[PDB]
């Protein structure tokens, strides 16, 4: 068992005992972050469709 | 997010919301003319999110009142709270519905919706940040059921990234006015379905049991049944109307409740049931509000199995015991939770007791059980539907038998896939 | 000297940099108005608790922090709170709403409208540094702030300042005191992104800390505040050598030359000794032998895990009190003898030991008793993968029946990075298999 | 109410174990992959160890020490005793064993080779005692309860796997006379029934015989083999102060030679039963192991020895 690399100081001191011895860039974030908000604008787009097509048929009922 | 705003439709969406509006303004020491005469500090720590803030330091209520006769509205306005609310969200129509969902939907509601949209718009508009609006109906009659899943419907087109709650009240020949009930339930399920992120599933069939089978009272008026209501009503709201560290609104709640986007129908419950001097102990609220007895939907949570649950203890009492009785039940009854979503029974304690109570316990069940209400409701349906029925009321208003169809479809698949997550 | 800049995302990561501040003021004897009498170098300086501090010309000592997340109510408290004086508002950041507990909302959707802000106030405290090391960020696994905008931040953090070393100080998730349901989503999903982006990072089960709050300061149910205050203890244990003269782990890349040989395998170990309670009248005080030997017992750990089924690739004993280097090493003797301490062939068995004669300041009206001498040891045992374990077991179950998935595939995410980011993991796991055992 | 789960469907043991649980009233089984329990019975390879002692207000013990395989593999096991200092390579009751990877008579095995030419290379004992009348070789079996405490239990019953051909020491090829396994076996079952001899007739064999007893000649070096093998893995294994509990049944096989020497030759971690026993060794397992932990509303002799020096 071996102490080596003592080191002191008013404060502490610090040593080591051996016991033994033996990314992507700015255009790809930016890129996939937006491509996310093209599926999130998508989806809404799906759904005021969708519910455009239920104004219709309210249309169609009352007429 | 702070700001909620409430839209109260038809007779019962009017009477129970009424009873809200009288049970939460006690609770934050807000006085039937508006003024607030309370003692603590947390009674307006958070009341932005249900009241907005008027000339005289007077609170009013982020509250509209639609319906399609005067009848109720008048009634609201002359009861005990009425004087509170703001004349400008009264928003009403002359001829009524007859309990007719094409009435409230397609004719009738179609004339008077945009006006109650420009009251939302202008309760929305004043909102620092408004977190989403909440519901309240009957499924049964053609105002609320027709007309409110209509205003849902509009809603949702104007504010498609606000959440979407309702206590929805739903029929049974046990409390039923008429006979077409079925009919206007299965019509706005199918609506409900896609439109709300959370819908608290009131069944008439429930209350009127814990009305007569455990409290002893031989006939119920509706006033008892909304007695029942408006104590869940406030528990619900508890965690949103006060502290405490608890950081969470609407959505953050709906995403922790939700595991699957058309199966937000929730079973709700309340414990102690009351029409007391002895407090319970936190067993007793444990066990009572996970009785099938105490559950607001007439299903038994033994049929099927817990989604996600919610528990919100109001009172002075130990946490440490609340966190040992809830792991308790969970333990002792592990069959009846879904293994497949880990820890999914939370936990919250408010120590504000709700009026009357010492302590009680508000019970928010997401149970695959509930397809036996859904079931019930497509049952009378088809016994009806079968041989067409009544539906000259609906093809009068210029609906065809293929949107029943649909509709009946629509249930039947919703019943399908609470039955596909029981069994796996 | 060179600074180190603390970012804090997250209601976790907030309430973490207020403990962790407060301390570093007790510490260094800095008050809340900001002024450090003992300071006689007014307007600047470059010592050692420079890197974490900055100077104006009144006599002012400024957190190199930067507190981020997605609502106000939490970061609300520390601008109205005890050391509201000790930060500038810039560095204050808040948005309206917040990221429901979803990492895709935090991530991608609101992530996107303020991660240029934030990167913007980052560099407004990188210009005032003479040398930038690179950063300390808090925050929770659990969050959608705390998962999923703190890996955007990380992404951009490399690109932004590629030369810099990044630290993680990890809350991972405890069932017993989150009222989140889907967690182990966002911890996976957040661990996968920032892998390789974080140099080292130090997990804090929320269970170990509780349990520690319940056996050793008989708190009955522990809050936040019982928590924080303890964690901010390890975190000054491991931070003191940055902020203090000393030469062990003196600057940020060498916390990750000492304890992480594997780049990937950069989950070092925390156990801490002695946690005793302020409210005891008797406490017989403990010796560096008794408070060493603590260090291996797995109810005083950072994560519940078994060292003993495992190997260390580094270790290191972090001193504070009167402590002395030959009682440490007899203590090191003894415990080699009676506890199992297996090291993989590549690395030596052995220790650093590092001491700080100044025991551990406790906080005034805190839980935690004055104490003549602790220890903080960081071990990056293969251990610590019981903790990936766990998560990963809870995140197959919900995945399976693609349970909650809806909530993030409709803020833009996609379904695939599921799976991408579980096989990453699947991999971590594999890694850390095929050193330990 | 406590609650436990299933894992290992060959385990005969508890299998047994599960039944008397059951038949109580007071044990429900859970699903096999269902959280929320108290007991595991586990299963051998690959237990999930690290998810064990994680749910919250539940005790959680399961039926297997971490670790305790380094004691169970041949390899591991001889590694063991010649790396510890408590057992070291002059260890006087281990036959002299030597690990290469995949009187001169050895043994090779982890398709077993009995030769001087030719996994582990282990002394064969060319001189054992011989049973009369038969002239045969035996194994005898002694099982081993560790509870939470780290309490070691021997059970009283143990047994001799008997082989029924008499020993020849020039034929080595003819398996059935060397080898003492029941399944090597099924002359089966000529002396005992299914070459099983029981303590009790053993004990008065060795009186009438030798003019001594199990309990002298044999079994206080068994208690001694056991308590050393046990307690030097302890501290490796021992799940005192830890966030789970573990206990273990342990099969620990022994041969005597012709001087009643006891040797080590095998420990199980996942043993069996002979068929008589089981009841009492399985009704043994809940009081001591099970109930200790999970109180609802002696078989064994423990080993424990502390001389002062
Ligand atoms: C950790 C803890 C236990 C807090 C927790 N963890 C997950 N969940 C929880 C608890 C709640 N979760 C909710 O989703 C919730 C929904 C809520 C909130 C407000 C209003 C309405 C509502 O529909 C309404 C009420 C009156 C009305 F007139 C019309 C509609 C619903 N309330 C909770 O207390
Ligand atoms: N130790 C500790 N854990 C916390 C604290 N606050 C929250 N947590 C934990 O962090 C997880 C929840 O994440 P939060 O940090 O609250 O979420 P957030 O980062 O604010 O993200 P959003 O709420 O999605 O905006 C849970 O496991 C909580 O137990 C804290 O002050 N200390
Ligand atoms: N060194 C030795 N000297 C004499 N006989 C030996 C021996 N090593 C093994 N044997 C014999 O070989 C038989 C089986 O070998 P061993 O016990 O090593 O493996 P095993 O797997 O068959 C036992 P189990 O299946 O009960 O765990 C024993 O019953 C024993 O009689
Ligand atoms: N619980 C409860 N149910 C009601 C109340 N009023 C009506 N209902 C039920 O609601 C249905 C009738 O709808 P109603 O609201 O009167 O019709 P609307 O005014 O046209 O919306 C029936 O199923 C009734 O049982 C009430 O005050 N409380
Ligand atoms: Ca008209
Ligand atoms: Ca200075
Ligand atoms: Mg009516
Ligand atoms: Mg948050």
């Known amino acids: 068992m071996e102490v080596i690399e003592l080191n002191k100081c008013t404060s502490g001191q610090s040593f080591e005992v051996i016991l033994k011895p033996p990314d992507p860039s700015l255009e790809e974030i930016q890129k996939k972050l937006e491509a996310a908000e093209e599926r999130r604008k998508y989806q809404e787009a799906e759904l005021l469709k969708h519910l455009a097509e239920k104004r219709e048929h309210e249309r169609e009922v009352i007429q | 997010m702070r700001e909620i705003v409430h839209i109260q439709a038809g007779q019962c969406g009017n009477q129970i919301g009424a009873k809200f509006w009288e049970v939460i303004s006690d609770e934050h020491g807000i006085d039937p003319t508006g003024s607030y005469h309370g003692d603590s500090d947390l009674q307006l720590e958070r009341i932005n999110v249900y009241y907005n803030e008027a000339t005289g330091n007077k609170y009013v209520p982020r509250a509209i009142l639609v319906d399609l006769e005067p009848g109720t509205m008048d009634s609201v306005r002359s009861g005990p709270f009425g004087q509170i609310f703001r004349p400008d969200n009264f928003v009403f129509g002359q001829s009524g519905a007859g309990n007719n969902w094409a009435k409230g939907h397609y004719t009738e509601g179609a004339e008077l919706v945009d006006s109650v949209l420009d009251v939302v718009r202008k309760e929305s508009e004043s909102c620092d940040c408004l977190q989403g609006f909440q519901l309240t109906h009957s499924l049964g009659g053609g105002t609320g059921s027709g007309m409110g899943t209509l205003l849902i419907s509009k809603i949702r087109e104007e504010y498609p990234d606000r959440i979407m709650n309702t206590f929805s009240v739903m029929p049974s020949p046990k409390v039923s006015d008429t006979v077409v009930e079925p009919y206007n339930a299965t019509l706005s399920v199918h609506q409900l379905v896609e439109n709300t992120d959370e819908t608290y599933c009131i069944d008439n069939e429930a209350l009127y049991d814990i009305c007569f089978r455990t409290l002893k009272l031989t006939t119920p008026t509706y006033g008892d049944l909304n007695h029942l209501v408006s104590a869940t009503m406030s528990g619900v709201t508890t965690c949103l109307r006060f502290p405490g560290q608890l950081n969470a609104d609407l959505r953050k709640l709906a995403v922790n409740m939700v595991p699957f986007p058309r199966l937000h129908f929730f079973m709700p419950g309340f414990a102690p049931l009351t029409s007391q001097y002895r407090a319970l102990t936190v067993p007793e609220l444990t066990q009572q509000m996970f009785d099938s007895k105490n559950m607001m939907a007439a299903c038994d949570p033994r049929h099927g199995r817990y989604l996600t649950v919610a528990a919100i203890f109001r009172g002075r009492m130990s946490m440490k015991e609340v966190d040992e009785q809830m792991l308790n039940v969970q333990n002792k009854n592990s069959s009846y939770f879904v293994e497949w979503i880990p820890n999914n029974v939370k936990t919250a304690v408010c120590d504000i007791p709700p009026r009357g109570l010492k302590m009680s316990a508000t019970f928010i069940g997401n149970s695959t059980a509930i397809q036996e209400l859904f079931k019930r409701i497509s049952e009378q349906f088809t016994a009806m539907f079968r041989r067409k029925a009544f539906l000259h009321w609906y093809t009068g208003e210029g609906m065809d038998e293929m949107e029943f169809t649909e509709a009946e479809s629509n249930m039947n698949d919703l019943v399908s896939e609470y039955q596909q997550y029981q069994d796996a | ?437 | 109410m406590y609650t436990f789960v299933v894992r290992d469907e060959n385990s005969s043991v508890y299998a047994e174990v599960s039944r008397l649980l059951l038949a109580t009233g007071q044990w429900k089984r859970l699903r096999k992959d269902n959280p929320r329990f108290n007991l595991m019975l586990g299963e051998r390879n690959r237990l999930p160890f690290g998810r064990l002692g994680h749910e919250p207000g539940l005790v959680q013990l399961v039926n297997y020490y971490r670790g305790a395989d380094k004691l169970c593999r041949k390899a591991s096991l001889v590694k063991l005793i010649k790396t510890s200092p408590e057992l070291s390579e002059s260890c006087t009751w281990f036959p002299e064993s030597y690990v290469i990877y995949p009187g001169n008579v050895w043994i090779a095995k982890s398709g077993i080779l009995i030769s001087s030419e030719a996994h582990v290379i282990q002394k064969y004992l060319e001189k054992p005692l011989l049973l009369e009348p038969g002239h045969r070789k035996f194994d005898i079996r002694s099982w081993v309860l560790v509870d939470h405490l780290y309490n070691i239990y021997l059970y009283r019953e143990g047994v001799l796997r008997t082989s029924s051909e008499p020993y020849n020491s020039a034929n080595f090829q003819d398996k059935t006379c060397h080898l003492t396994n029941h399944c090597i076996q099924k002359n089966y079952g000529r002396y005992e029934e299914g070459n099983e001899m029981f303590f009790e007739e053993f004990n008065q064999y060795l009186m009438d015989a030798l003019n001594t007893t199990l309990e002298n000649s044999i079994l206080l070096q068994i208690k001694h083999i056991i308590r050393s093998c046990l307690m030097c893995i302890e501290p490796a294994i021992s799940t005192k102060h830890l966030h789970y509990q573990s206990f273990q049944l342990f099969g620990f096989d022994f041969m005597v030679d012709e001087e009643l020497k006891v040797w080590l030759i095998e420990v199980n971690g996942a043993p069996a039963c002979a068929q008589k026993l089981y009841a009492e060794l399985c009704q043994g397992i809940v009081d001591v192991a099970i109930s200790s932990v999970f109180p609802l509303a002696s078989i064994f002799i423990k080993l424990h020895h502390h001389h002062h020096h």
């Open chain 3, 1 to 437: 000297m060179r600074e180190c800049i603390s970012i804090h995302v997250g209601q976790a990561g907030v309430q973490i940099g207020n403990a962790c501040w407060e301390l570093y003021c007790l510490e260094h004897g800095i008050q809340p108005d900001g002024q450090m009498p003992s300071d006689k170098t007014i307007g600047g300086g470059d010592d050692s608790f420079n890197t974490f501090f900055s100077e104006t010309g009144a006599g002012k000592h400024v957190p190199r922090a930067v507190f981020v997340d997605l609502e106000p109510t939490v970061i609300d408290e520390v601008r109205t709170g005890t050391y509201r004086q000790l930060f500038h508002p810039e560095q204050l950041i808040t948005g309206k709403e917040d990221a429901a507990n979803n990492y895709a909302r935090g991530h991608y959707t609101i992530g996107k409208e303020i991660i240029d802000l934030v990167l913007d106030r980052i560099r407004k405290l990188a210009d005032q540094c003479t040398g930038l090391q690179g950063f300390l960020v808090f925050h929770s696994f659990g969050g959608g702030t705390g998962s999923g905008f703190t890996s955007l931040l990380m992404e951009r953090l490399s690109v932004d300042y590629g030369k810099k070393s990044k630290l993680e100080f990890s809350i991972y998730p405890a069932p017993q005191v989150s009222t989140a349901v889907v967690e182990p989503y966002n911890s996976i999903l957040t661990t996968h992104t920032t892998l390789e982006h974080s140099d080292c990072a130090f997990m804090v089960d929320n269970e170990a800390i509780y349990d520690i709050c319940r056996r050793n300061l008989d708190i009955e149910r522990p809050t936040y505040t019982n928590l924080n205050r303890l964690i901010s203890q390890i975190v000054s244990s491991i931070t003191a050598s940055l902020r203090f003269d000393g030469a062990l782990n003196v600057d940020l890349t060498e916390f990750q030359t000492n304890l992480v040989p594997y780049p990937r395998i950069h989950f070092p170990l925390a156990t801490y000794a002695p946690v005793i309670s302020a409210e005891k009248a008797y406490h017989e005080q403990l010796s560096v032998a008794e408070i060493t030997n603590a260090c291996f017992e797995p109810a005083n750990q950072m994560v519940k895990c078994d060292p003993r089924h495992g190997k260390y690739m580094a270790c290191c004993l972090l001193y504070r009190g009167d402590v002395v280097p030959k009682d440490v090493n007899a203590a090191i003797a003894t415990i080699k003898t009676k506890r199992s301490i297996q090291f993989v062939d590549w690395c030596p068995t052995g220790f650093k030991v590092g001491i700080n004669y100044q025991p551990p300041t406790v906080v005034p009206g805190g839980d935690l008793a004055k104490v003549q001498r602790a220890v903080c040891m960081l071990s990056n045992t293969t251990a610590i993968a019981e903790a990936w374990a766990r998560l990963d077991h809870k995140f197959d179950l919900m995945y399976a029946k693609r349970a909650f998935v809806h909530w993030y595939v409709g803020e833009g995410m996609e379904e695939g990075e599921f799976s991408e980011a579980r096989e990453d993991m699947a991999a971590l796991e594999k890694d850390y298999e095929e050193v330990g055992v």
